[PDB]
Amino acid sequence: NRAQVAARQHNRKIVEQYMHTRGEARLKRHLLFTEDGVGGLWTTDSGQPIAIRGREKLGEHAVWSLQCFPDWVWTDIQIFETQDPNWFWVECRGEGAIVFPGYPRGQYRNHFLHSFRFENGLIKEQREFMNPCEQFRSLGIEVPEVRRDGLPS
Amino acid sequence: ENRAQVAARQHNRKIVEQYMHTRGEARLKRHLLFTEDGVGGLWTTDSGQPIAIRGREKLGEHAVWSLQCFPDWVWTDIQIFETQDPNWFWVECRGEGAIVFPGYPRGQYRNHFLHSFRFENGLIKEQREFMNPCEQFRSLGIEVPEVRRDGLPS
Ligand SMILES: O=C(c1ccc(Cl)cc1)c1c(-c2ccc(O)cc2)sc2cc(O)ccc12
Ligand SMILES: O=C(c1ccc(Cl)cc1)c1c(-c2ccc(O)cc2)sc2cc(O)ccc12
């Protein structure tokens, strides 16, 4: 129990560090992961995650993260510990320029949930969840509209 | 203080369990798990704004529509997360069932969901569910736009 308490307190510090990582520090965020750790975006247009698998690949991906989201900041961070000392959830927002190849530069804002699962004091699995429709908007991509006439309102 | 927090968390967890396992005709009374002014709804939609049902009475009325448009809906793969706030829980799960939206072909809708439950005085003050609307678009036959990935490596 003292060990679970210790694990939770340490893991929480890693979540805080991850969520506050911005700027050039993003180039070393992958060091918060286990060697086989996975991090990525679970909510995309395809319905499949875009997951970066392995600490080395996460470090390589930071280059592309900094290209596509050059000034990204997580804001409004609320960290939730859970009964599992190795599992945390985060509710937050994120904002920054979006610079996707072949799209106009945009300003992207979204609400996010993150899941952090730990192993031996480092992140084993990070997942972020958002509404892709807001990212479509930031890219100038038309968002389909569910017709609401027949729904209660 | 800790005893009161522990008591609140244990009770609130039972309410979350009950909510997540409410199926079929019991859905018509799910609103009784809310405070009178409780709010529940879908936070992730095509508009970017929540579709929130405000007040226990309106939640009960909305259950009628819910049972018509998602007549056999179930939540599955339910994982309930207590938090350091005895009045705040998160749930990761999936949901599935027929989707019968007005003016759209009858479909089968499956999605991954996160739910947030915030409690006041032992009942739900705020329920919010979060999903990827693209999967609901697919269930309705609505074309999902595709972000071009040619310059976007993973
Ligand atoms: O926004 C992201 C994203 C993907 C993964 C991660 Cl880890 C973070 C963001 C998205 C992409 C991406 C892929 C590779 C890359 O190098 C940078 C961005 S394609 C895509 C397609 C969507 O419908 C929504 C989001 C994204
Ligand atoms: O599926 C839902 C939904 C909304 C709120 C709640 Cl509480 C549950 C489901 C959605 C809608 C709705 C509105 C009112 C109603 O009576 C039934 C359905 S429009 C819409 C539009 C979207 O792009 C995605 C989901 C929904």
Residue numbers in the entry:
A (entry chain B): 13 to 165
B (entry chain A): 12 to 165
Task: Show me the paper's own sentences about this structure.
Subsequently, cocrystal structures of BcPhzB in complex with 10d, 20a, and 20b were obtained. The binding mode of 20a/b differs slightly from their dihydroxy analogue 10d. Although initial results suggested that the cross-monomer binding of Pro164* by the 4′-hydroxy group was an important factor for ligand affinity, the large distance between the donor–acceptor-pair in some monomers (e.g., 10d/i) exceeded the range for hydrogen bonds and suggested a weaker contribution to binding. Potency was further enhanced by modifying the 4-position of the benzoyl moiety with lipophilic substituents such as halogens or a pentoxy moiety, resulting in the most active derivatives of series A, i. e., 10d (IC50 = 1.7 μM) and 13c (IC50 = 2.8 μM). In summary, most compounds of series A and B inhibit pyocyanin production in the low micromolar concentration range with the best compounds exhibiting IC50 values of 1.6 μM (10d) and 0.9 μM (10g), respectively. 10d and 10i show 3- to 10-fold higher affinity to hER-α than their parent compound RAL.
